[PDB]
Amino acid sequence: HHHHHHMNYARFITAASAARNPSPIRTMTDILSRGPKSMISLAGGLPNPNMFPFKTAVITVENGKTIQFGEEMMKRALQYSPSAGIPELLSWLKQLQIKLHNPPTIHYPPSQGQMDLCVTSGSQQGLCKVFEMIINPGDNVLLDEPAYSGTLQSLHPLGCNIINVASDESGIVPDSLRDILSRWKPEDAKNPQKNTPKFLYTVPNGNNPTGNSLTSERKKEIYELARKYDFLIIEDDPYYFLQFNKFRVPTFLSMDVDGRVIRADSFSKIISSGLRIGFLTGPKPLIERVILHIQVSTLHPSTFNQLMISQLLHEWGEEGFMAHVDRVIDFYSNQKDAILAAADKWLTGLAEWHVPAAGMFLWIKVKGINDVKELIEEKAVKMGVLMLPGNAFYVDSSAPSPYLRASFSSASPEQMDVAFQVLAQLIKESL
Amino acid sequence: HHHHHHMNYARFITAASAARNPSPIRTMTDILSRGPKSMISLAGGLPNPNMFPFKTAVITVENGKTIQFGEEMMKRALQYSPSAGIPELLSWLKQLQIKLHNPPTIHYPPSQGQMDLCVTSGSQQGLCKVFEMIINPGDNVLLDEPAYSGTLQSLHPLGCNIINVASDESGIVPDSLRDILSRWKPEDAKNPQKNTPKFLYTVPNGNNPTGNSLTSERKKEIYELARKYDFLIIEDDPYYFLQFNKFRVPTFLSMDVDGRVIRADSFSKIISSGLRIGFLTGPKPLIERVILHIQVSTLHPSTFNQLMISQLLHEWGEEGFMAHVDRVIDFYSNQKDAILAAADKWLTGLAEWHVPAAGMFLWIKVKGINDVKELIEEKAVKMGVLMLPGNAFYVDSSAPSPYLRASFSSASPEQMDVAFQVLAQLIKESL
């Protein structure tokens, strides 16, 4: 018997989200193409692209072929395109997801969670619209702190109760999640008044700010709890392609037999943050709610920027894409080694840290102080150094934090050495 | 005494919108630049742009200088940028708004509505976030039908009561608005339980689908009603730069002594729809709520696409921008003349229409039929022609509509002649 549980997606969709109806720009593109080519439509609502002033583009690529938009491709790049993304980018990304994650839901019926993808204007846009789709005021949601400050700022106005799940150097601790969920009975998920959690959100690789990643065994245990208590998992994975380990841990999407995982991927850290391109992968009924919200907001991701990325990826193939990933990992892993060496030299005895598993941040706990912000934004700024106090990564940002987040994306080894010399002095003269 | 009334912006901001707090990507950009240049920050959260694969760009321009992104500019184009837009585009657009509209609010205190601008990922994103900022379920809002289908689809899930204001060939009819508002007393606006309308929304030039535009005298009367009953005006003006008249009618923004107008502009019809660039202009406290929502969603408009537009506009200057506008008007006005000639020839006696004042649509009322959709999507599609039934432009899209929207953005005169021959035959053989 094929594995996986029946889902009722209506439990995870607000009344406003369910009320949305389709609003594409001129759906006649289907009735015209299949019909006669001599079919004259005065029914469309597209501006004439011959008026647009940019005419051709040439974009050079390191380790890839030059990208050229000739006259006709430029007119396409400068015109509206489908809400979920251009078809050639969607098709390539779907094949990538199948290669990397082989999701169980690929061939499910739509109504029981068939895998669907949506290109978004950055991954964070997809996450925001997912949160907005699900959360009514008073709903309970689960996540591990410290968390990305932007996620916390997105959730705050929605009025949900954020329930912290304990975490350590291997991510969320399943025993903590199990203990929290024992507040409910599993059947309470079928009774709205009981207010069982709607979802668990986590960054499973290279959490910002901690650098920690989940293990495979913990992901399996967490997934089983999500099935038992019938909550969704929001897998926000922007550092998926920045793991230092040779082998990537299987994702929640890869084990999602039920159709309860919404995954966010991004090329923001590896290909371009400024182009505003990410993508959601998840069950069709939930992805459809996000698409409909896009249709009345941004309409679509930039057609031009999608064509840039799509042409890059098609020429690279999976091989060239993974080779690029491996160059970027190599660079960040060397930066990681450099910042750890500077910490070993100058901060030993004064602070403690875990080795980042992925991403671009080192999370430093200063010993013998209750709050860092004293010796950073008032003392380190006078000595020529700035690192980020940890307070902003908690729901309660006023509580004291002895943590600093240090970035290793760009500093040279010399800059890291100086920076940690200064920090060591500050810690010393503050004890 | 300087003209304009005290505003209380809290009356137009939902609890969720007011709850938002600032969430920029690493605000340390200010403490670093003014500080010493030898200040080492490990506090930022930017990915290293040297990893990104695109290295230079060359973009040709008709009637303008070729745009070049060299190595350093490309790294900027591929990186995160500020939520409200890049500074050089904001500054140029602010000067444009001052030139075109000379808004009264330029030098007001922030708290009483100082003019502020936000570049958005298309104008519709700004409008969506404005609607979301204002509307609680059950709130009353005012607009004229027929209206852009996307606006209606955006408002539907928010649960507002849409109150139709009568409109004719000169836009909203002020006597209708006055009669509707007589349901309330002006002081009811200071009593939430009375549920006075929160805003009036309109497309004042070249309404989609009608082609009609407001007159100056009506705008003044409408503005006075907005002051008297204390509602905002949402001026959605994507065809502002596509007016066929030599002189543009003054905008609501140009008369906004109170700070009660939120204006949406777009370059989607004139420079590029696919680049997803528009902008809001409005009172600082309201624009700030939109920016904060952007900060947790799209983060910013594509940096690359903003640099393309900004470099185009700076090289053109106001003179080159207006010259481009005038070429585009010339083209669309000729298309307008062509579709009117085809209507004169083939549809006279069978339909009636008003001459479009702006934009790219002709709105045709078929005589002697209650609903068109019979003779379009089941009869015209077999004869090689498609035009858009008017039903989608009303809140009640199931009510019969004898109207068709015909686009003149692209068809040749020959295609228009054929299309209207067919439509004339269909009307004839359906009576």
Side-chain angles (χ1 to χ4, degrees), chain A residues 26 40 42 48 53 55-56 58 60 62 78-79 132 272-274 276 293 298 302 305 384 386 405 407 409, chain B residues 26 40 42 48 53 55-56 58 60 62 78-79 132 272-274 276 293 298 302 305 384 386 405 407 409:
Chain A
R26 281 42 144 193
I40 297 169
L42 304 174
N48 191 317
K55 299 300 181 182
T56 69
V58 179
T60 59
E62 187 174 354
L78 298 178
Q79 184 62 280
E132 291 166 335
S272 172
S273 43
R276 302 287 68 223
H293 196 176
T298 50
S302 168
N305 300 349
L386 184 65
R405 192 196 70 179
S407 173
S409 65
Chain B
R26 281 42 144 193
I40 297 169
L42 304 174
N48 191 317
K55 299 300 181 182
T56 69
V58 179
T60 59
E62 187 174 354
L78 298 178
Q79 184 62 280
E132 291 166 335
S272 172
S273 43
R276 302 287 68 223
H293 196 176
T298 50
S302 168
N305 300 349
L386 184 65
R405 192 196 70 179
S407 173
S409 65

Side-chain angles (χ1 to χ4, degrees), chain A residues 108-128:
Chain A
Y108 289 5
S111 54
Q112 278 301 304
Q114 189 178 31
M115 187 186 74
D116 197 21
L117 279 75
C118 183
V119 183
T120 60
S121 296
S123 65
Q124 182 61 222
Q125 184 198 37
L127 192 69
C128 189

Side-chain angles (χ1 to χ4, degrees), chain B residues 271-291:
Chain B
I271 292 173
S272 172
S273 43
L275 293 185
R276 302 287 68 223
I277 297 296
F279 56 107
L280 294 179
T281 307
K284 193 164 162 58
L286 303 178
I287 299 295
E288 185 175 7
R289 292 301 100 189
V290 172
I291 290 165

